[PDB]
A paper describes a structure:
The eukaryotic wobble adenosine-to-inosine modification is catalysed by the ADAT (ADAT2/ADAT3) complex that modifies up to eight tRNAs, requiring a full tRNA for activity. Our structure and associated enzymatic and biophysical analyses reveal that while ADAT2 active site catalyses the deamination reaction, ADAT3 active site is inactivated by the replacement by a valine of the glutamate involved in proton shuttling during catalysis but also by the capping of its zinc-binding pocket and the loss of tRNA recognition determinants. ADAT3 N-terminal domain is essential for tRNA binding and deamination by ADAT and can rotate with respect to the catalytic domain formed by ADAT2 and the ADAT3 C-terminal domain, without affecting the structure of this latter catalytic domain.
The ADAT2/ADAT3-Δloop mutant complex could easily be produced and purified using the same experimental procedure developed for the wild-type (WT) complex, including the ion exchange chromatography step to remove the bound nucleic acids, and further crystallized. Two crystal forms were obtained, diffracting up to 2.1 and 3.0 Å, respectively. Crystals of ADAT2/ADAT3 that diffracted up to 3.0 Å resolution were obtained using a crystallization condition containing 0.1 M HEPES pH 7.0, 7% PEG 8000 and 8% ethylene glycol. Structure determination was made by collecting MAD data on ADAT zinc ions on the crystal form diffracting to 3.0 Å resolution. The combined MAD and model phases were then used to build the ADAT3 N-terminal domain. Specifically, while the very N-terminus of ADAT3 interacts similarly with ADAT3-C in both structures, we observe a rotation of the ADAT3-N domains by around 90° with respect to each other. This rotation is only due to the movement of residues 34–39, the rest of ADAT3-N superposing very well, and possibly of residues 152–160 that are not seen in the electron density. Inspection of the location of the positively charged surfaces of ADAT3-N with respect to the tRNA revealed that these surfaces are completely opposite to the tRNA in the low resolution ADAT structure.
Numbering used by the authors:
A (entry chain B): 25 to 151, 162 to 237, 270 to 349
B (entry chain A): 11 to 176
Amino acid sequence: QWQALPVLSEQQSGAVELILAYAAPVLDKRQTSRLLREVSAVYPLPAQPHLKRVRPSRSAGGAQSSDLLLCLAGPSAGPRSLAELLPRPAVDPRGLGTPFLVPVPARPPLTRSQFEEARAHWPTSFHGQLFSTQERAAMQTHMERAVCAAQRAAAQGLRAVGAVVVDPASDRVLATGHDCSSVASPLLHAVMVCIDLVAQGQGEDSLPYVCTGYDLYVTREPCVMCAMALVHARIQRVFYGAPSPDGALGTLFRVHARPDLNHRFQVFRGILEDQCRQLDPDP
Amino acid sequence: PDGPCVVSVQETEKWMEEAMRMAKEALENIEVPVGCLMVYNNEVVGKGRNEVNQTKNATRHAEMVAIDQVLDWCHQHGQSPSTVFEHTVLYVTVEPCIMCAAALRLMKIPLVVYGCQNERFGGCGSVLNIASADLPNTGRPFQCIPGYRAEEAVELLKTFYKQENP
Ligand SMILES: [Zn+2]
Ligand SMILES: [Zn+2]
């Protein structure tokens, strides 16, 4: 019942991008209620919930027709017949015409300035879902593990910040750690501790880019020192609960989504957020 | 003015000629050729060169080594780190990366003398300016004295990357 929201580049966050979709006109406007049921059940388009599925048309003259948003377009976007796209008897297609391609906006508009821009290619609403529901449990028990570690830290009197490093290939926990900053040793944030764990557990022949391929779950958003460390170490994905005030993966910087660094990686935020809001922030 | 900063700044030629020697040390050790010193009151408190390939760990930049050497030098002599770092001048061959800039902020270092720019990863202006940034919860901003013996220091990087893949 939490969502994971990508944190995207400064540039890429404020633009409206499109994808090819097949639509088809509705000739027999009384099959509309029916054809909507039958079709958005076969192709529910989970990645795109912002898209109203009937587009109204008006003719100079006042002729009101509609087109039905059918399904996403394959990697080879040629013309496709009704029979090819709509399996029977899942979909009694009568009432539809030949299907055409149409650019439809790929992501839900966040500002009203994108909303009026998206609407112009296909209707859309104002004010998605990214993962399987077994991977949603993968990240469940890992963030939990990082909260369990975060709390251990606060109980002892340490920055309440926890972090686990997961190898997504086997969903095996590779390092669990929390903040260990002391007066004698101030740079042991949770993220820095987890890296030095990972590095010491690797064979003689190992690249010094000690995080390649691995996921990271942190309670709150990494500071600049931590975030850049994950860049030098080449982490693959990072999931955090809540942001941090000087956070470098969303709040004050997005160092994962820059051209200037030699490396770029996905960042998602919100995983088990309600728990992490009351954990401490990095740094 | 800080008393232990002005005294340390005086023998700057001396601290760089050793900082450079440490970069030649790291070069012939197949490391990114960065070497640095940390001077508290005209005495070297931590030294350090890049140890990245050596440790098979990429966070072990020269500056991050030295910070650990100075936290040691604090622990043996039982001095609190706050009262040592806040009066320490760091001499490094190459503008600190975006990461090391943040560490030095958190350690509340006040001043940094670097040689040549850091085009790949520099956090003192080149890519981001972490040093002077307004980061209320990430330590204290610090100022920089750029350029010292940069030509020598850059001809060390140039002759590390035309040598990594020709
Ligand atoms: Zn941190
Ligand atoms: Zn560095």
